[PDB]
Structure formats: C-alpha cells, structure tokens
C-alpha cells in the first residue's frame, strides 16, 4: 500500500537524545509514553501531500552495546545523527557515527539529517554555525529541536523523509 | 465504618479526595497522588498490596528521600488510640469494666493492620533494598532505633525478626537435586589453558561455560543500576557497575567472535570457524541463553563479517538456517524474541538491552508530577511501569543453570580481551581492514592465504556424550 | 500465558516461606524469620503450557490471624500446608480451610493439602490421618521438604492444575 521508511535515530547516550522520537509519536497534548506497546515506534504521517508510514528505530539506552551499533544501522535506510548542544564531545562524536553509518551501508551517499537537540536550560556549548558548518561540508541537512517543547521535532523527521525520497 | 483519629493529630486521616489521590479506572490502582497519600495506601488497613510495596521501594528516590521515607512512616506507625465512649464512661462510672468495643475494635482493624505493613514495608526495605542503608549509615542507625523501640507484644514477633535480619544484612547454595551433565572436552584437555581458543575447546562446553557466565552477571544487576536511568548518566561507573560489566562482556564475545573470524585468513579454515560460531548459537538457543544468540548474531552482521561472500557461500544450508532463525528473534523491534522469552522454561538469559529502552523511554517519555486542581501529585503510574520492567527482570534472576562450572574454562573467558590495548574505533577500523584483506571488494580477484591452525578443523558437534 | 494467583497458608513456622523460596530460587532458608506477607512471580511450563505464576507467603502467627479475608479474596487456590512433626498445625488446617470456603463464599475453591518437612524422622502426623482430610475436602494431599525440594514442585504444579480445571 503506503511507503514504509525504515529511520534509525543515533547519537551519543545520556543527553537526551529519546526526546526526539517520543515526541514525534507522542501527540504531544497528552505527557504520556508506553515504549511497551507496538505502536509507540510506528506512526502514519502525511509529507508533502504523500501519505506514508514511519518505522523509527531509537535504542536510546543501549549505547554501550557498541558491537551491536552496526546490526541496528544495518536494519535503515535513512539515519538522524543526533547531538545535544550542550555537549560538545556528542557533537565531536557524529563523525564517527556518519563514518559507521556510510561502512555499514556500503555507500557514500546514505539519506542522513544532522539534529541539534536542546535537553534542558545547561549553557549551549555548541553555537549553530559551528553544526550547519559541519552538516554542510557532508552534504546534509541540519535541524535544531527542543527536547521540550516539540519544536523542530517534524521538521527533522520530515526532512530525513524527504531526504530518502530525493535520494 | 470505624472512626478515625482527626487529621489534626494524624495526617494520614485525611478523607481521599482528587486534590490529594487520582485512581486509575480487586483493589484500587494508583495513578497519582501526594507522598503522605502513597504512604497511607502502601499501608492500608484494609487490605496489603506486597506488589505496591516492591513498587514503591524500587522507585521512591525519585520523589522522596531515604530519611524522608523513614520519617513518614514512623509517623504513620503512631497511631492515636481513641477515647473511651459514653458507654465506657457510664460503666467506669458506676465501677463496672467498660467493653471498649470501638476500642478493641480500631486496634485489632486499624492499629495492629497498619503497624503491622509498616513494619512489612521495614522488612523489605531492609531485605531488598539494603543499599540506601550502605550508602547512608545514619539512615540505619535510625532504623535500628525505630525498630528497637517499638514495644507491645502484638509487634514483638517481627520487631525481634527484623531486628536479626539487619544485624545480619550488616555483615553480609542450591538444589537441583538432579546432577549437571558431564563437562565435555575437545582437542584442548583439562588443565591446559594455554591451548584454549574458539576451535579446540568443544563448542557445547563454550555455550555452556558462557551461559553460566552471563547468567552470574545477568542475575547481578540490581534494580539500583537501572531507576532514574542512572546508567546513562555521568556517574554511571559508580550507580551501575553490575550492569556495565554484563554489558561490557557480551561487547567483548562479539568482538571476540569477528576476530576470530576475520584472522584466520584462509577461506576454508574461516569457514570452520564461523560454521563453530553458528554451532555454539545452536547451544546457546538450546539454553534459552538470549544473550548468546544476539552476541553471535550481531557478530555476524557486523561490517567486517557481513560482507564475507564467499565465507557464506559455503556455510552449510542447515546452519544458514538456524543463523537466519536466530537473527528473526530481532526483526520488528525484537518481536519474535519477546513471545519466545515469554514462552520458554526457565532458566534463560534475557537480552538486557530492551529493557535498558523502555526504562528510560518510560522515565523521559512521563511527567514526574501530575497537576490537578492547583496541586501537584507525584506521577505514581509512570513509577509503576518502571517497576514492571525491573520486576520482569528480577523474575528472570531466579532460576539457576544446573551446569557445572569449569574453571579454567571460565577463566578463560573472564579475562578474554580481544582489543588488547587498542582503543575502540583503532580496533574497529583494524577489524574491517582484515575484512578487506581477506575477501577484496569487487572487482579485485579473491587472493590466496596460508592455513593457520594445526590441528583437525572437525567439529566433534553440539549433541552431547554419556559415558556412564 | 495464563496467569495463576497461589496462597500459601498455614500455621507459623510449618515452612510456608521455606517451600516458596524453594520453588523460586532452588534455595533453602534455614533461618526462621515470621512473614507478614510477600509475594513471588515464576514463569514456568506445566504440561506443556507456559504460567506465570503469582504466588502469596502469608502470615501463620496469630497475631497477624485479623488479616486474612483480604488475601483469601485474591487467591485462585490455596496451598494449605501443615508440618508433618507438628500436630497442632495440622489442627489448624480445617480453620484456614473454612475461613477460605467462608470469604470466596464457596465449596470448590482450588486447594492442596501438604504435610511439609517430610526429611525429619520424628513425625507425629500421619500420612493416613493427613489424607483422610484431603479426601473429605475433595483434594489432594502431598508432603514436600523445603529442604531436599520433595515433592516441591509437585505441590505447587498440582494446584496449578486445579485452577486450570476450575
Ligand atoms: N527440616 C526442615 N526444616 C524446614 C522445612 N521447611 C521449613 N523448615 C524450617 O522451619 C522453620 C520455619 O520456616 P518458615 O518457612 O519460616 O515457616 P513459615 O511457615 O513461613 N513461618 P511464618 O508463618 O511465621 O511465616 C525454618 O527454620 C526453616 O528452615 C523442611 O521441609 N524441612
Ligand atoms: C540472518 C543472517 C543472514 C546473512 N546473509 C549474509 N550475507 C550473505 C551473502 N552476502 C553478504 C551477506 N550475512 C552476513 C554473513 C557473512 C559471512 C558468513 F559466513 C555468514 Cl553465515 C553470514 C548474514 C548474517 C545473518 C545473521
Ligand atoms: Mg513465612
């Protein structure tokens, strides 16, 4: 029927990083997650007039896993490499992930977005110049979310759709 | 209906109401309400909730401190007696012995019920959640007091009990009674560790020693590693040890497994190997050891693995299946692998790091607090979930393997280390370059390389032997 | 996976929590520490059916005899245990036997008798006296050790299986 996108969020553990996701397939006009039931990861949105079907994959929580990091980008086919602009070693980290990412995939062209994600009120450490610099000179989107307030949160998995469709 | 104490003199006498508790649409469900409300319910008089009591220890730091706990609850404990009634008064009165029925009524209904939870909720505390006593030793000094102090026969059983089990906790064996099978032996003979490698131990006693292993250091994680998703936070060395060292294994079998495979250079000999992996998967599935299955199965679709054409053009198609079986578990978010493990005998090891993601989704995806009518009431649902998942955890703690452990094999794999001294990312890029060395990519023609290993590359099997 | 609310009642100290503990954890507590009342899950397949199994450790002092109608309430069947070397507690059985049919208000409510610490050589209870009562209440009777696991899992399953047949 509909177009599925299977999308694989990433990115440095302890930062927040989860907020994206829930937020998306929360509603937010109700506060409320069950990660437990099969519906919380799936979500059916209308994009550019194109119905289709978002499948996210965010094992937020299982970072030290690191051997497995390869088998859950495996399952994508477009990647949301996620940093928190208060934490700048996050940010130094999306290299490496867009670096796994393109090896597991076996291309250099893999449908990506950079997300910028605000968790809290902490000092902002990473300024936007410095992510749309680096998101430019890989050939990529860069957008900028709050952790709170939903903002940015569409915007970011809309884009990465937009990315795949294009590709 | 009893009468109570007024709420002047007891707060924990204060008519329920949608400012102070919310209930979810048999006794009544939670959802939110105020600590002194939490309290009352988790020792009501009218019925125990040990399910409520598990709940409520596991979660309560995140809106009430240890030494706040304790200081409610001996509040709770004090209960006020109620004055003798006009019919009392009209007996003492005239000389005669009062009935005291409203008495001894609210004392064997209210006061012996409530005091007694309290003290059940002591017990738990004190058996199960023994680490805010270890971290804080004015915490159990106070406890032991409270516990000491408390007078009255009706207590006296459980006073004396609970006070034996702290003196106990402070200084702080299995049945089967059917025997383990035999520890079977390959090409590597007992006592020579220094021949122990993936090909000449037997694969069953691998699958075997490595499922006691991850079942020690599953069984090990306690709930205090997991609630406020402490680790994933900076102090997560300290708050989550147990955890990260299970973790940091089952990373290390995995990288331990794409070595193996991408340095033995010679196809047919790598083949061996990777057909001895998928063999050893094979038990580990046998055993219900989750854990096993995913370490092998991320092995094999990791990138230096995964792109090994003609290693996997001559795996055997019996054991092309039971790898594509296993690696199914995780397709659709793991939905295979959550109705098997719900379906399977104990003992098993599960795979930990789905309930890692639905601990802390649980705990950022809920509010803390609910506000109603001008009031903020603690978000006890939200606390109940989280204790599901740990509950579900500490269920899967229980059941021991009855397989005996060989401890040189043990060893062995207790001090594997297959990065050596090399960071992370210099020993992934290492890993893959082998990948690349071993089988070019397309169109560089597939080299040659010499035999590695010695001796019979022969799988003796994973059917286990009896001799008598 | 059906789930299944077990009791365990009986008079103090006759090893309620010794055979619970046995079951869950293949372990024997040899320390006598009075419950107020815990509770346990186990997962398990019984002919060929996966349970989950929630199982109630009661309270057997007296003191705590005020507090039972609110459990008896919850429980799908009942292990009404006795120590085979302690007669006053296979006196005590019929009271908790009709207290349960009084709360549930009912003649057929799931129940085993089980005659525990059948490793102990000076028994005063007899296995004939025991199973004449099983007889008149309709159920069966099974002695267990918590600390050898006789008869454990048979206890526990068969009132499984009279649940599930209910
Ligand atoms: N020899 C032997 N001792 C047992 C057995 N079961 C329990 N005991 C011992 O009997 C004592 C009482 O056990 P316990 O399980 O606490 O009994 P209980 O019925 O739960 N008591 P309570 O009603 O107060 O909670 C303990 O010292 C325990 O080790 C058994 O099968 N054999
Ligand atoms: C279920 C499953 C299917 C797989 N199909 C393959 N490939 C086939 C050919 N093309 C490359 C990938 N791989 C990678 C691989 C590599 C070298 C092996 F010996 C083996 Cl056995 C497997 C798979 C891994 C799993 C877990
Ligand atoms: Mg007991």
């Known amino acids: 029927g509909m177009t599925e996108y299977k999308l694989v969020v990433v990115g440095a553990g302890g930062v927040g990083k989860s907020a994206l996701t829930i937020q998306l397939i929360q509603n937010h006009f109700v506060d409320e997650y069950d990660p437990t039931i099969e519906d919380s990861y799936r979500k059916q949105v209308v994009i550019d007039g194109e119905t289709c079907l978002l499948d996210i994959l965010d094992t937020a929580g299982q970072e030290e896993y690191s051997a497995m990091r390869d088998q859950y980008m495996r399952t994508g086919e477009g990647f949301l490499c996620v940093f928190a602009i208060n934490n700048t070693k996050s940010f130094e980290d999306i290299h490496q992930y867009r670096e796994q990412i393109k090896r597991v995939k076996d291309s250099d062209d893999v449908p990506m977005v950079l997300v910028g994600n605000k968790c809290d009120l902490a000092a902002r450490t990473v300024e936007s110049r410095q992510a749309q610099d680096l998101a430019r000179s890989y050939g990529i989107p860069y957008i900028e979310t709050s952790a709170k307030t939903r903002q940015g949160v569409e915007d970011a998995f809309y884009t990465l759709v937009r990315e795949i469709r294009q590709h | ?468």
């Open chain 2, 1 to 468: 209906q009893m009468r109570l104490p007024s709420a002047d003199v007891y707060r924990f006498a204060e008519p329920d109401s949608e400012e102070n508790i919310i209930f979810e649409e048999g006794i009544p469900i939670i959802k939110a309400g105020t600590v002194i409300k939490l309290i009352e319910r988790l020792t009501y008089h009218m019925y125990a909730d040990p399910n409520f009591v598990r709940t409520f220890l596991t979660t309560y730091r995140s809106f009430c401190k240890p030494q706040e706990l304790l200081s409610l609850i001996i509040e709770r404990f004090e209960i006020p007696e109620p004055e003798p009634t006009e019919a009392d008064r009209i007996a003492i009165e005239n000389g005669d012995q009062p009935l005291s029925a409203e008495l001894k009524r609210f004392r064997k209904e209210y006061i012996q019920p409530v005091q007694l939870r309290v003290l059940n909720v002591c017990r738990h505390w004190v058996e199960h959640h023994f680490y805010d006593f270890e971290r804080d030793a004015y915490l159990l000094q106070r406890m032991e007091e409270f516990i000491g102090t408390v007078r009255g026969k009706a207590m006296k059983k459980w006073v004396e009990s609970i006070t034996k089990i702290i003196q106990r906790k402070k200084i702080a064996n299995i049945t089967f009674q059917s025997s383990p099978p035999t520890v079977e032996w390959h090409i590597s003979r007992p006592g020579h560790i220094e021949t122990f490698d993936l090909l000449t131990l037997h694969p069953i006693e691998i699958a075997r020693q490595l499922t006691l292993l991850e079942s020690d250091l599953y069984r090990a994680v306690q709930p205090s590693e997991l609630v406020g998703s402490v680790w994933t936070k900076e102090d997560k060395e300290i708050n989550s040890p147990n955890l990260l060292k299970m973790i940091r294994h089952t990373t290390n079998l995995t990288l331990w497994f794409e070595k193996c495979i991408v340095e033995t250079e010679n196809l047919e000999e790598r083949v061996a190997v990777v057909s001895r992996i998928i063999e050893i998967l094979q038990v580990f599935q046998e055993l219900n050891n989750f854990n096993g299955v995913l370490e092998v199965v991320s092995a094999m679709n990791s990138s230096p693995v995964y792109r090994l054409d003609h290693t996997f053009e001559q795996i055997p198609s019996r054991q092309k299946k039971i790898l594509e079986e296993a690696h199914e578990l995780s397709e659709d978010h793991y939905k295979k692998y959550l109705a098997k493990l719900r379906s399977i005998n104990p003992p098993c090891v599960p795979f930990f790091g789905i309930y890692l993601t639905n601990i802390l989704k649980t705990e950022e995806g809920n509010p803390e607090v609910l506000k109603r009518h001008g009031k903020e009431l603690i978000n006890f649902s939200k606390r109940r979930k989280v204790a599901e998942i740990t509950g579900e955890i500490q269920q899967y703690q229980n059941q021991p393997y009855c397989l005996r452990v060989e401890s040189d094999i043990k060893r062995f794999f207790e001090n594997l280390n297959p990065m050596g001294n090399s960071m992370e990312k210099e020993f992934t890029d290492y890993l893959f370059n082998k990948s690349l060395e071993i089988e070019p990519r397309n169109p560089k023609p597939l080299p040659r390389f010499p035999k590695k290993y010695s001796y019979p590359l022969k799988s003796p099997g994973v059917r286990p032997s009896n001799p008598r």
